Ligand binder design. Structure first.
Ligand SMILES: O=C(O)c1ccc(-c2ccc(-c3nnc([C@@H]4O[C@H](CO)[C@@H](O)[C@H](O)[C@H]4O)[nH]3)cc2)cc1
Ligand SMILES: O=C(O)c1ccc(-c2ccc(-c3nnc([C@@H]4O[C@H](CO)[C@@H](O)[C@H](O)[C@H]4O)[nH]3)cc2)cc1
Ligand SMILES: O=c1[nH]cnc2c1ncn2[C@@H]1O[C@H](COP(=O)(O)O)[C@@H](O)[C@H]1O
Ligand SMILES: O=c1[nH]cnc2c1ncn2[C@@H]1O[C@H](COP(=O)(O)O)[C@@H](O)[C@H]1O
Ligand SMILES: *Cc1c(COP(=O)(O)O)cnc(C)c1O
Ligand SMILES: *Cc1c(COP(=O)(O)O)cnc(C)c1O
Lengths: 810, 810
């Protein structure tokens, strides 16, 4: 139908149809008279999977023969979403499958909606890992993603009475056709025990064994016939486990609980024992796999030439002492040689500066669970602090600040400090964040080893986040500049030549309008909600957190409501304000914010005087597959975190690529996005980082803003008095109290500038031609934010390998 | 190679080879350079499974169109064993697959050994269910087996220091290619709650829900293109279950524990709550499935014309009050109509008279777990006892004896009494057992309703238990009388014409000798044990229980040892004595017996004076796949239970079919086997049932036998003094104490007759020609013991359906 979806040749369509019917009969054991849409989805998924496997086997064979340097990306999270459509796009099968299914009397889009998201992540960090796997395959790198196969991913969110309720995400209920169990490659992982010192070094004995069973998922590159592997470990009890009889069998569940559920915290360190077990489990199993593959090509001098290990935050930081343990205790290398190998192999990416998000494990936990690792950590610390003392003699305070061991009521290990000491490269995820690392929290480390510190600005894959979710936009771009931009996003710069082209302006605006109609229809069908598709679609979708300032958006929404009630008969630009995202189950304030948003909607959406001029919608169960629907429909992207708190953001980049304008602070990657597009093509407001610092030095007093801004005072009075909660007048007192007395993120300090900037947005939206020209300037300069660019920089500057766009044979 | 294994035509062999390679590549995702034997097994299993599915779909379609009466066989156990070879035999693919795998450079027998047993049963009762499913499919009945998909089946037995150790039977570790998950047909099962009485009858409310997810396995008939279904339920938590957050997800394990593990008791009622939950779970899910299928063709008058439910012992007895509950509470039938329907639908098979094996559930358990069912049971009981009172006025003791409710310290429900009251037919499993039921434990019920009581003598499938496990014997029979006997075992009677045929005598003896060499080699390879293949193979394999009298075999073994030591230089017929079987983990005496057997072996097998004249071997991990190896190698079958205790036996029949002579008591089916073959062709000894009764009336005094039999006294002194346990002199004092003072099974009372009868066995074994002629007379008269005969009798006399040998189209 459209050119970017590939060819639908007669023989291909014919062969897909016969294999579809073969899988329906032989694989699913169904005849056509009793098959449901779910059966048809599975028949298609198996048909498409067959096209992967030849390429998957050939790719892994190629790597075994050529023996390139191997990249191991270790993460506790991979937020993959759905696989069917992505696979078709990357194999150029989308039009052929569409045609083949059409001829069988089926609508492929309907079948795509049946697939469960693989929701094995919380948000941005997990989704970055997914985009990176896509870019690594597309750039022909011999890369492996290693993680945990959680039985239950991020919870499904239901809203009941305006409150979030959590239910289990039973994503494997109907099976996962994309994975292949590899029980033959099962490996032991040890816990507890104690350390014996013999004449032949240390020995970790009396341990409890849990088995790690791998499941492999294929990761196809974009049209290059490369298929890499994501390997996810599942926990299994050994067969002699506890072996009255019946209870011993039932107690196998305790070992297997390790891979049961994803901890649903975003930017918050909770620190449960079960979580520590997850971290070690992934590290221990992965390192054995790495070493096995290295031996099948004992001289570990070449280890760093054949292996790179990238640590996605500190969550797999135990890789450092585990590698030391294996090399010293099992392979009998001397300490110094082992340390040299470890440092050259490992690299660490930091994703946050929020103090509450940093992992600091109590010593007593490590002592009980991983006593050998704690000994190795103490040794690392003492040798590291010996270097600090020689570089900065007499600076005793520096020694305390840089220690891996944190003193206090409870002694803790600072895992970030461990990662820095044991890695040859430490990077932040956006220029401003990387600078903040060097000036604030890692300042001491930067002064000792300036050469370690780098920036690698985040990106997103243009396959999922343009071609897949927004085919109409992809097509009109392709009509002008061809298809090469899909694996070379800098080519979007050519679109600047069409900024005064009337046909292109019309086409960009038409695609957006189609995306909005399609999303407005989706809302009516699945959720019984009616929205005006001519209104400005004002969208904030991301995890619910105080730093992201969903509350500042709420204040603006109530301001617009109060202005309408004050002057009912004045024209205002109609808006649909959409906010979506999950709160961690333990995060009370985040749950209260969700309730506030739905409470505002209850008043605004049923006021007859407002009409369809203002609607507030809480988008339920925000996840990767919902992002693919709402982002292409957005006009305005809300990226309004307090300057200094969002390390990068990636949602911001998704909206830029899909034809929304951005309102935001100079935070994270927003800064680089404005630099690429021009500040005149961005709605920037609020305090810069330096302004936040000056306000902290003087002391943030929220009362001052309350006293000087009548419109803000009115809102706080409405909240306190029960205007938005008539049956429970004091329902929002914790929100009011926080805003007035304990606001770490300075919501009131940015209120005035935000409202004024929002007025400029509305003024531009009244002139569609100029709105659309500004959009073209954003899309055209979004090329820097391809994850292909990000990964090429990791490859050359950290991993020491050269990317490639060359195709393997088909 | 051999004719009974079917044809290996060029096109079939070619097509199997290509599909084998297709599955290796596409299904297993392996190339040939890294494939292991396990991969090759799976590639073959998937190749063979493909041939089932067309037939499976067509059969189930045929049943939906014709709408025959449906037979539902409910069991807590299905002891299936391996499926690959059985499937090839029933589809006539064995030679073609052998040839196809040979051409690919693979040995099919080697690949068959990789398959795990489906060990979802304890012993005879579970294996009977498996044989019955095979015969039902072979006789073209529209039959469904319904049970539980246990995650862990009967434990794997290891012997360590001569003691049994249990380990978990993780049979699903590598996957099960034979099953198909059907999560689309998942059904709710309720527990706990309470009963509300409204004006609209009773209502069961406030319950906890567990989901039942079905897994379907194909059951092929013998060369008739019929493929029936075994449906096994797996337990799943609902998604709102317990919905802090993390613990609620982990607590899903409590619901799913229902289908976790088989209770490993044989002929012993343990009565744990988790076991009661298993019983209700299978019943509740199955009955909803039955009713759904009945509605898709509300007038329940025709229900018994379209449905038969057979209860495999009392384990699914809750089917009776569950059916009443559904018909009265949900469908709103009046009680009397519902009861009429229930009685005509249900039939009950009893498998034991041992008091400790009968299920008697405490009222408090039922009251808490299934309060509505307990109310229905009380109502059933009161109406039933009203009938007894009208038939036998004034007989108050009869009322107490026949009650469903048993009085005492704890009130209990007698489930056998429930089954009799709620079934139109009650059968025993061998003529002597069925008579015992009418004269002893169910005497009162027989006097009230004589028409209910039947016999259906057990049988075994000649597909698994001759063609599959003993191809050499099957072939030499087929050479003389053709192949028709495989589905018409009465045709073995024609072999009586060859009893004086010298070629046939030679061939029968040669097949046995080949089976013995092959088993002696198997022992050396897998277990490092060396046996003389010219010795008489004396075999007792069955679950370890006091009633089966493995201890009487032990006494004979020690008698032979002591006789050899007394007269070293006298000729005796060499024997290899093989005893195998599992003890329930809680059954202390059974575990002690295993230790005694290995202790006897430790003395006997290392005495230089004995030489290879006597060996005692404990066969480890006895299970269906080991039965298939050892039974064809046996010369002597030990079936030596105390008369009145083995309801039927089926191992006895397996040995008869495979060319062993039998030494046994007149117990269970042994009686009918001797009747068919002629008593002159059986080694019968010991007390009859009537002799046991006379001895019980007088009082069993074991001391009398000790005082009068010097050889028996010597053995007891050896046991007591520590001859068989030198480092632990009193190790066997519990065995000695039981034998002397508390022996319920009268081991000493049969000792003398047993030893004398064993001497007659040895005398016959010295004359190979006459031994072999007696064997031919046994094989030739074994036709009655086909499960095809058994099932035809259930069909005509209980279920009211006509069997058929007609083929469906291919
Ligand atoms: O249960 C636990 O103990 C536990 C659970 C989860 C976590 C956890 C999870 C995620 C994060 C986290 N830190 N930064 C992130 C996000 O990473 C994205 C990709 O670089 C950035 O674009 C975002 O700006 C940043 O906020 N996520 C931080 C901590 C920590 C502990
Ligand atoms: O855990 C529990 O509560 C529990 C577990 C298991 C059982 C249970 C299991 C099996 C049996 C049982 N009763 N007879 C049997 C056997 O059934 C065979 C087929 O008809 C006969 O050939 C045998 O002669 C007979 O011993 N098995 C009886 C009870 C009962 C309770
Ligand atoms: O010994 C070998 N011979 C041939 N190919 C091998 C061997 N070892 C690994 N390979 C290839 O490389 C892959 C190994 O996967 P891995 O062991 O997970 O790295 C296989 O799919 C093979 O194609
Ligand atoms: O509504 C129907 N139309 C056509 N075939 C049906 C229908 N319902 C059941 N069947 C057939 O009977 C089988 C039903 O399996 P069951 O529901 O487990 O008894 C299916 O495999 C179909 O072939
Ligand atoms: C991109 C994405 C995120 C990250 O969004 P931010 O605005 O950068 O926090 C979170 N969740 C989902 C489902 C995403 O697709
Ligand atoms: C046949 C069989 C049984 C029953 O044997 P009995 O001698 O009748 O108790 C038990 N277990 C297995 C594995 C069998 O094949």
């Amino acid at each position: 139908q459209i050119s970017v979806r590939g060819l639908a040749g007669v023989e291909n369509v014919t062969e897909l149809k016969k294999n579809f019917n073969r899988h329906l009969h032989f694989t699913l054991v169904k005849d056509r008279n009793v098959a449901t849409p779910r059966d048809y989805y599975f028949a298609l998924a198996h048909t498409v999977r067959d096209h992967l496997v030849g390429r998957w086997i050939r790719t892994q064979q190629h790597y075994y023969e050529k023996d390139p340097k191997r990249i191991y990306y270790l993460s506790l999270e991979f937020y993959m979403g759905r696989t069917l459509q992505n696979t078709m796009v990357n194999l150029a099968l989308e039009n052929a499958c569409d045609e083949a299914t059409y001829q069988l009397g089926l609508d492929m889009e309907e079948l795509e909606e049946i697939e469960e998201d693989a929701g094995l992540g919380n948000g941005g960090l997990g989704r970055l890992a997914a985009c990176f796997l896509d870019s690594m395959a597309t750039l022909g790198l011999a890369a492996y993603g290693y993680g945990i196969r959680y039985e239950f991913g991020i919870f499904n969110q239901k809203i009941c009475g305006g409150w979030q309720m959590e239910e289990a995400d039973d994503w494997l209920r109907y099976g996962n056709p994309w994975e292949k169990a590899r029980p033959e490659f099962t490996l032991p992982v040890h816990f507890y025990g104690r350390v014996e010192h013999t004449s032949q070094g240390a020995k970790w004995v009396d341990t409890q064994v849990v088995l790690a069973m791998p499941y492999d998922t294929p990761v196809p590159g974009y049209r290059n016939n490369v298929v890499n592997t994501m390997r996810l470990w599942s926990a299994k009890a050994p067969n002699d486990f506890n072996l009255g009889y019946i209870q011993a069998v039932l107690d196998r569940n305790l070992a297997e609980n390790i891979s049961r559920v994803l901890y649903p915290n975003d930017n918050f360190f909770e620190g449960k024992e079960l979580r520590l077990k997850q971290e070690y489990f992934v590290v221990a199993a992965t390192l054995q796999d790495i070493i096995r593959r290295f031996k099948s090509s004992t001289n570990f001098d070449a280890f760093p030439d054949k292996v790179a290990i990238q640590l996605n935050d500190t969550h797999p930081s135990l890789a450092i002492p585990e590698l030391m343990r294996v090399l010293v205790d099992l392979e009998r290398l001397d300490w110094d040689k082992a340390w040299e190998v470890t440092v050259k192999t490992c690299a660490y990416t930091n994703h946050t500066v929020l103090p509450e998000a940093l992992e600091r494990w109590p010593v007593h936990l490590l002592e009980t669970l991983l006593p050998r690792h704690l000994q190795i950590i103490y040794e690392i610390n003492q040798r590291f602090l010996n270097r600090v003392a020689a570089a900065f003699p007499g600076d005793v305070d520096r020694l305390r600040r840089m220690s891996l061991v944190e003193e206090g009521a409870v002694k803790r290990i600072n895992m970030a400090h461990l990662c820095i000491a044991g890695s040859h490269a430490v990077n932040g995820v956006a220029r401003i964040h990387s600078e903040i690392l060097k000036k604030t929290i890692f300042k001491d480390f930067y002064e000792l080893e300036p050469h370690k510190f780098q920036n690698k600005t985040n990106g997103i894959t243009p396959r999922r986040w343009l071609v897949l979710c927004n085919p109409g936009l992809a097509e009109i771009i392709a009509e002008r500049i061809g298809e090469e931009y899909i694996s070379d996003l800098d080519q979007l710069r050519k679109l600047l030549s069409y900024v005064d082209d009337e046909a292109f302006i019309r086409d960009v605006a038409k695609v957006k309008q189609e995306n909005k109609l399609k999303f407005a229809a989706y809302l009516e069908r699945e959720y019984k909600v009616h929205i005006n598709p001519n209104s400005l679609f004002d969208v904030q979708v991301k995890r619910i957190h105080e730093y992201k300032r969903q509350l500042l958006n709420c204040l603006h929404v109530i301001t617009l409501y109060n202005r309408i009630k004050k002057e009912p008969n004045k024209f205002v630009v109609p808006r649909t304000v959409m906010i979506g995202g999950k709160a961690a189950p333990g995060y009370h304030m985040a749950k209260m914010i969700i309730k506030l948003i739905t409470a505002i909607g209850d008043v605004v959406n049923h006021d007859p005087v407002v009409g369809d001029r203002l609607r507030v919608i809480f988008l339920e169960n925000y996840r990767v597959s919902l992002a693919e629907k709402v982002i292409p429909a957005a006009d305005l992207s809300e990226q309004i975190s307090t300057a200094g708190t969002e390390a990068s953001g990636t949602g911001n980049m998704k909206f830029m690529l899909n034809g929304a304008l951005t309102i935001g602070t100079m935070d994270g990657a927003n800064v680089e996005m404005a630099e690429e597009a021009g500040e005149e093509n961005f709605f920037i407001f609020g305090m810069r980082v330096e302004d936040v610092d000056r306000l902290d030095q003087r002391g943030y007093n929220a009362q001052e803003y309350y006293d000087r801004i009548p419109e803000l005072r009115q809102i706080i009075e409405q909240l306190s008095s029960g205007f938005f909660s008539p049956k429970q007048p004091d329902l929002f007192k914790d929100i009011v109290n926080m805003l007035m007395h304990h606001d770490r993120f300075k919501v009131f300090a940015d209120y005035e500038e935000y409202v004024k900037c929002q007025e400029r947005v509305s003024a531009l939206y009244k002139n569609p031609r100029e709105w659309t020209r500004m959009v073209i300037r954003n899309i055209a300069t979004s090329g820097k934010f391809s994850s292909d660019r990000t990964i090429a920089q990791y490859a050359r500057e950290i991993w020491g390998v050269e990317p490639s766009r060359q195709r393997l044979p088909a």
